[PDB]
Design a protein around this nucleic acid. Sequence first.
DNA 1: TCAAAACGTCGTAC
DNA 2: TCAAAACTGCGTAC
DNA 3: GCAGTTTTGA
DNA 4: GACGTTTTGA
Lengths: 154, 153
Amino acid sequence: NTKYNKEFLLYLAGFVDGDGSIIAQIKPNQSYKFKHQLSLTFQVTQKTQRRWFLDKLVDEIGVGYVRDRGSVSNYILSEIKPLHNFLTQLQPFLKLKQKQANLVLKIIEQLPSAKESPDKFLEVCTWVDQIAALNDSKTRKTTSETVRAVLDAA
Amino acid sequence: NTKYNKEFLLYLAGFVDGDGSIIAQIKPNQSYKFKHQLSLTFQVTQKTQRRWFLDKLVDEIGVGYVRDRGSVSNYILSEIKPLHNFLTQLQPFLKLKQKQANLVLKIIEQLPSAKESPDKFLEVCTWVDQIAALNDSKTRKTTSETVRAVLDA
DNA sequence: TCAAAACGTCGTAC
DNA sequence: TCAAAACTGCGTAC
DNA sequence: GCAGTTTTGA
DNA sequence: GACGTTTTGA
Ligand SMILES: [Mn+2]
Ligand SMILES: [Mn+2]
Ligand SMILES: [Mn+2]
Ligand SMILES: [Mn+2]
Ligand SMILES: [Mn+2]
């Protein structure tokens, strides 16, 4: 797998702790087996005027993309297995967001097996709670005990 | 005159490009020669719940302090001498605030010199102009031209 | 007078 | 059904 | 920053 | 985040 330079990871770890975001979501979607999608997102926000910085991350991380949303842009990394590679090498240098990073890694490994059982699928949903608790969460809606609800009504 | 660990500078440079501010101001104060104080501030902002992060900074930079303001806390470094030392070491790793880092570095070297002539001081004031230019400035008032605007008297 | 601190404001860039 | 994308809403932490 | 809701496209 | 205003203390 792609092995990133230490000096890059050190700088990048500091920037992510500043303006990055590591997100786990339970997305209500009827298309899905347990009526919910597990979504992981690594994200670095920056004012579009400085877009070049985010675009250079695409070059250096070697995967991911940049979306421009008006006056702000975001580098996005959603593909679950490059995510795993990248967060694995970054996680040792993160101070503020290390616990989130390690959970997202954990969820990724326990995700094939999260499709087998509603009991297991609930356990992983629990982990997502923990990630959102560690974040500066303000507008979250779908907890694991929301999944719990409509896994009983089924 | 401390030498900071390189693995530390690399990380801190990232965090600073993220939530840090390298501020140069011109402060209308009658007490001063030309009725203005040149002020330099290095600062890192964080929600107070993470004040421990800012604490650690103070410990590792060895100089500077932490201020609270309700929900938000700040690491602050203003003393001209260690500011020069620290920025000189940090500067080569910055990517978004490297320009500001250096302009400050050079305003400092010129500080005693700028206490000499009206012509010189306000040249330094246009270096301060440039620093707000690079920053996400939104509420600036005293620019370098309200400086000799006053020196028009 | 001067370095440096202390306290407030304001608009985003996250 | 699923991984992944696309887009919007929103309240701060800067 | 950290979510939400929706859509793609096999 | 990036300021402004004001005060300390020799
Ligand atoms: Mn931050
Ligand atoms: Mn929280
Ligand atoms: Mn930033
Ligand atoms: Mn920020
Ligand atoms: Mn600007």
